[PDB]
Ligand binder design. Sequence first.
Ligand SMILES: Nc1ncnc2c1ncn2[C@@H]1O[C@H](CNCC#Cc2nc3c(N)ncnc3n2[C@@H]2O[C@H](CO)[C@@H](O)[C@H]2O)[C@@H](O)[C@H]1O
Ligand SMILES: Nc1ncnc2c1ncn2[C@@H]1O[C@H](CNCC#Cc2nc3c(N)ncnc3n2[C@@H]2O[C@H](CO)[C@@H](O)[C@H]2O)[C@@H](O)[C@H]1O
Ligand SMILES: Nc1ncnc2c1ncn2[C@@H]1O[C@H](CNCC#Cc2nc3c(N)ncnc3n2[C@@H]2O[C@H](CO)[C@@H](O)[C@H]2O)[C@@H](O)[C@H]1O
Ligand SMILES: Nc1ncnc2c1ncn2[C@@H]1O[C@H](CNCC#Cc2nc3c(N)ncnc3n2[C@@H]2O[C@H](CO)[C@@H](O)[C@H]2O)[C@@H](O)[C@H]1O
Lengths: 261, 261, 261, 261
Amino acid sequence: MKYMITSKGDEKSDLLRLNMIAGFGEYDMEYDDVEPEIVISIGGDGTFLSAFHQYEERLDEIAFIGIHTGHLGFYADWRPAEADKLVKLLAKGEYQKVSYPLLKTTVKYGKEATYLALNESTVKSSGGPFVVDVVINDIHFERFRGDGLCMSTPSGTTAYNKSLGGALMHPSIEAMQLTEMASINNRVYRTIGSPLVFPKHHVVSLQPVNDKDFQISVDHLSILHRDVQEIRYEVSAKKIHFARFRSFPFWRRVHDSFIED
Amino acid sequence: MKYMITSKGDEKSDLLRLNMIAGFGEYDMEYDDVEPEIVISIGGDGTFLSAFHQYEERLDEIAFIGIHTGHLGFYADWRPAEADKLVKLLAKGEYQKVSYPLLKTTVKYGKEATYLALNESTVKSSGGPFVVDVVINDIHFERFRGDGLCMSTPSGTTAYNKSLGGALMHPSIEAMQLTEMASINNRVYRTIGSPLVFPKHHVVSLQPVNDKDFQISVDHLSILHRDVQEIRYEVSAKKIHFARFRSFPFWRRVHDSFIED
Amino acid sequence: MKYMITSKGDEKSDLLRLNMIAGFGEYDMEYDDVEPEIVISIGGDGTFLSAFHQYEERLDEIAFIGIHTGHLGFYADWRPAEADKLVKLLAKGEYQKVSYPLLKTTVKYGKEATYLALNESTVKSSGGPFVVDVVINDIHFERFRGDGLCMSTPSGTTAYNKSLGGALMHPSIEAMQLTEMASINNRVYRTIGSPLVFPKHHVVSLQPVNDKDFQISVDHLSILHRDVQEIRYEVSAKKIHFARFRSFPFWRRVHDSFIED
Amino acid sequence: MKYMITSKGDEKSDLLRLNMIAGFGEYDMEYDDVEPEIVISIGGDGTFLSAFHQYEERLDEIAFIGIHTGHLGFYADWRPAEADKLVKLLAKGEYQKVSYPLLKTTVKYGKEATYLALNESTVKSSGGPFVVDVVINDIHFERFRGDGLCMSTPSGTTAYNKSLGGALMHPSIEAMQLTEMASINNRVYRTIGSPLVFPKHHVVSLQPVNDKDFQISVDHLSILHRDVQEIRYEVSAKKIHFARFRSFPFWRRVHDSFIED
Ligand SMILES: Nc1ncnc2c1ncn2[C@@H]1O[C@H](CNCC#Cc2nc3c(N)ncnc3n2[C@@H]2O[C@H](CO)[C@@H](O)[C@H]2O)[C@@H](O)[C@H]1O
Ligand SMILES: Nc1ncnc2c1ncn2[C@@H]1O[C@H](CNCC#Cc2nc3c(N)ncnc3n2[C@@H]2O[C@H](CO)[C@@H](O)[C@H]2O)[C@@H](O)[C@H]1O
Ligand SMILES: Nc1ncnc2c1ncn2[C@@H]1O[C@H](CNCC#Cc2nc3c(N)ncnc3n2[C@@H]2O[C@H](CO)[C@@H](O)[C@H]2O)[C@@H](O)[C@H]1O
Ligand SMILES: Nc1ncnc2c1ncn2[C@@H]1O[C@H](CNCC#Cc2nc3c(N)ncnc3n2[C@@H]2O[C@H](CO)[C@@H](O)[C@H]2O)[C@@H](O)[C@H]1O
C-alpha cells in the first residue's frame, strides 16, 4: 500500500532507506509521506519517537515498523540485515497488528492544549522550586515538592520511568505509571514515594501551589508553559499500531536490552 | 442471608462480634460459618487475611467485609462505630459487589500443590544462598541470586511489595507484580532490578539452580518446601468479592494509610 | 564581641532580631556586620545558607548560630522562645565551638572559579542530554548519562542527597558523598548506581563528553556555566564553626526532623 | 618469615598453593599455620573471609594477601598468573601494609559474646516478625519493623550493603554503615529509610520489643541467638592489615568489579 520511510539522517540509515525504497519499487508499493499506511523508522528509539509524533493524527490508519541501525531499541526491533526479508513480507501483507497504549496530556491555561506521548510526559519547575498538588479522580492525594513527576506509558516504563525506580510494565495493560523525581519528605512534606499505576479512565491532575510556570516534556519535546492552571494525565483512547511479522515478546526485548543479548 | 463473623480474639473485637450477631438476630439473617454468603472480619488486615483463607474454596459465593478495631486496614475499611449502620445495610441487601484479582501459586515436586494469595507470595532459601532461574512464558529472563522474590496481587502492592520498592497498583488491573529482595549485581550476576508487572495469562516460573529447598510464603502462611522443581505464578481465574456499601476509593484508602488520615 | 544578625525578612524574624539586638545592648556586645565574630541566623535553613555564604571569606573567625522561627532546621536548631537565654549565654562566652566539613567546587574554563558549599553542589545539563565522564583521583571511573550528579557535605546528606537515595552521614566524618540523578543503565550505558563516599584529599572530577554547558548549583545558588572543561570536587580545607551551648546531637536532630518531634 | 596458605579446596587453588609453598622453600620462608605473619588466601572472597576469621585473634601480627582463582574479588585482588612474582616480592619483604576498619558486634543475654566482622553483621527474626528499637549513643532513634538490619564495614559496603541500597564507602574512613531490609512505613510504623553512616566511638544498640530470638549473621557465620537483650555495633579498635605490593586503588577495584574490567 502507501508507505514512507524516515531516517536517522546518518550515512548508514539513509542508504538503507534508499535500498528499501528500491526494493519496494518491485511491488505494488507506493511511496507517500502524506497518507502512508506503513511508516518505517530507520535509526534509534529517538528516530522512532519522531516518526510517531510525525503522524500522530493518523495513528488508526498507520502501522509502524522500527529498524535499528545502531543498537536494539524497544521500538526499532529489526536488524538492518533483515531489511530485504522485511520488504518482501511487508509487500505481501496479511500481517498481524499489535497495539500499545498511549498517554494523553492536557494543559489548561487562563485555551487548553493536548499532547500524545509514546514514552512519557514529565513536569518540572521553570527555575525555582517545584510544588504541585496531586489530584486523582477529583480527590486530593498529596502535595508534591521535589524535582518533578513522570507519567509513563507501558512501553515507556523501560525508559525514563525505569531510571526513576518505576516498575516495568507489559504493554497489553492499558494503564499509566507515575513516578517521583527527588521528592522531599521531612516533617512538613510528605509524598507516597512509591510509583503509582493507574488504569483506564483514571484522571491524574496536577495543580500549581505558587509558581504557575512549568517545563513540561512530552517524549523528546520540552516546552515552557506559562500561566498553567492544570495538567491532566489519562490513558488515551488512541493507540499506536505496530506491524508485527514474527514473535518478539516484550519481556524478551527487555531481557536483550538490559540483561544480555 | 447466611453469614459469619470472625474476630481478632481481643476484648474489643469479640464483643463487637457479639453485638453484631445480636443485631442480625432482628432480621432474616442466619449465622452459618460453614456456607456463609457474607463473611465479616473484625480486627486487622491479618484477621482479614485469615478470614479469606478460611473460605478460599467458596470465594464466588461469598462477599467479604472488613471492620478495623485497631487502625484502618486496606481490607478492614469500616470503623467500629459504624457497625449498627452496617448491620442494617447488610440485612436489606441489594448492595454492589467489588472484585479484586488474586495470585495463583503452584509448587511442583518430584504431587504439585496450589495456593491462593490475597497479598503476595514470596520465595526464600532454606538457609544457604538463594539462586533461581526466572522463566517468563517459557522464556529464560534472568538468573536471580539474592534474598528472595515477591509476587504481589494489586491489593498486595501496598504491603510487602511496597517495602521492596514496588509500585502501587489499582486493583481494577488484573495483574501481578514481581519485586526483588536484595539482588546481587556484579560482574557475574545480573538481574533486571526493576519491579515487573505481568498481565493475565502470563506465567512466571522459578526453577532451582542448586539447592532445591525453599521457604515459600503465601500471605501469612510460610512453609518449607523440599525437592522443589518449579514455582509457577499467574493471575488466578478466581477473584475475591467485597461487599461495598459506600464510596471508599482505593487511592483515598492509600492516602489515608500512608499520607495522612 | 562583634556580632551580627540576619533575618528571614518576615514579621516574626525581624522583631526577634530587634529584640536580641536590644538585649545585646545590655552587654559588651557590638553590632558589626562587616567583621562579626558571631553570626546569628533567624529563619529557616535557607536563611542560614544565605548567612553562611554571606561570610564565607571569614569562616575561621566566625561562629554561626541558627534560630528557627518556622520549623526545626538542621542548621537553625534554636527555638525563638529561647532567644533571651541565648543572648545571656552568648554574651558571657567561653562556649564550645563545633566544626562541620565543607565542599570545595572548582570550575575550569578555556580563568577557573571556586565555590564553597555547606549543603551540596549539583551539575545538570543546559537543555539537552547530560553526559559526563567521572574521574576519581585521575582514574576514569564511569561515563554518567542522566539528569545530573549531586555532591553533598556530611550535613548536606539530610538534604538533597537524602531525596536521591543517599546515605545520612555524621558531620564528624570529613568526607563528601556523590549521588546520581536518574542515571541511564542499559546495554550501552553503565553507572555504579550506588552513592559514593569520598574521604579527604580524594578529588572527583567531571569532564564533558559533548555539550560543554552545565547548570551548576552551589546550595541555593545556580549558575549556567559555559565552555566548561572540568568540575572538581573535594573536601575543603575550610570548615564552618557553630557556637554550641547545649547538647543537641546530630542523630537526635535527624530523629526530630524525619521520625518525630 | 612465618606464613601459611589457605585454599578454596578446588583443583586449581590446591595446586597453586602447592606451587607457592615450593617457591617459598627457596627462600627464608617457614610454613606455619599457627603463628603466621603472612596469610595467603587462594580462592574467592568467601575463602578470604574464612582466612580472616581463622586468624582474627592475631590480626595485628598478620598481613593478609588474597589471590582470586575465579573472578576478581575485593579481597582476593591478585591474579593466579602473578603468583611467582608474588612469591619473590613477598620473600624479600619491606612492603607497605594497608589497614581496613572492622565491625565489632556484641550480643548480651540474660554472658555476652563479641564478634568481629570484615564485611557486615545482620539481624533477622527467628520466624515471626522482626521488631527492634534502634538506640544511637543511648538515644532512642527509631522503632524498626521489617526483614532486618545490616551493619557494614567500609570494605563491606560493596557487598550485602550495596544490594540494600547502601552507599559505597572508602576504607580509609573509620566508620560503619547501617541499612534497612524491607522496612515497614505506614501510619503506625516509621523508620529513617536512608542508610546511616556512623563514625568511631558511636554505639548503635538494637533492643528487642517482643520476640527475643534473632538470627544474627557475622559475614558468612549465621547463628540463632536466644534470650537476647541487646545487640551493640561499633567500629572496632582492631583493624585488618593487607600486604600491598602495587597500587590497586579501591575505586579502581570498584570500577573493575561493577562497571567493567
Ligand atoms: N534521565 C533519563 N533517564 C532515562 N531516560 C531518560 C532520561 N531522560 C530522558 N530519558 C528518555 O529519553 C527519551 C528520549 N530519547 C529517545 C529515546 C528513547 C528510549 N525509549 C526507550 C524505551 N521506551 N525503552 C527503553 N529505552 C528507551 N529509550 C532509550 O532511551 C535512552 C535515552 O534516550 C536511549 O538508550 C534510548 O534508546 C525520553 O522519552 C525518556 O524516556
Ligand atoms: N518486611 C515486610 N514489610 C512489609 N510488609 C511485610 C513485611 N513482611 C511481611 N509483610 C506483610 O505482612 C503481611 C502479613 N500480615 C498481615 C497484613 C497485612 C497488610 N496487608 C496490607 C495491604 N494489603 N496493604 C497495606 N498494608 C497491609 N498490611 C499491613 O501490613 C503490615 C504488616 O503486617 C500491617 O500494617 C498490616 O496492616 C504479609 O502478607 C506481607 O504483606
Ligand atoms: N529536590 C530536592 N529534594 C530535596 N532537597 C532539595 C531538592 N532540591 C533542593 N533541595 C535542597 O534545597 C536546598 C536549598 N533550600 C534551603 C535549605 C535547606 C535544607 N537543608 C537541609 C539540610 N541540610 N538537612 C535537611 N534539610 C535541609 N533543608 C531543607 O530543605 C528543604 C528544602 O529546601 C527544606 O525543608 C529545608 O529546611 C538545597 O541546598 C538542597 O539541599
Ligand atoms: N543478598 C545478598 N546480596 C548481596 N550480598 C550478599 C547477600 N547475601 C549475602 N551477601 C554477602 O555474602 C557474603 C558472603 N559470601 C562471600 C563473600 C563476599 C563478598 N564480599 C564482597 C565485598 N566485600 N565486596 C564485594 N563483593 C563481595 N563479595 C561477593 O559477594 C558475592 C556474594 O557472596 C560474591 O560475588 C562475592 O564475591 C556476605 O558477607 C554478604 O556480604
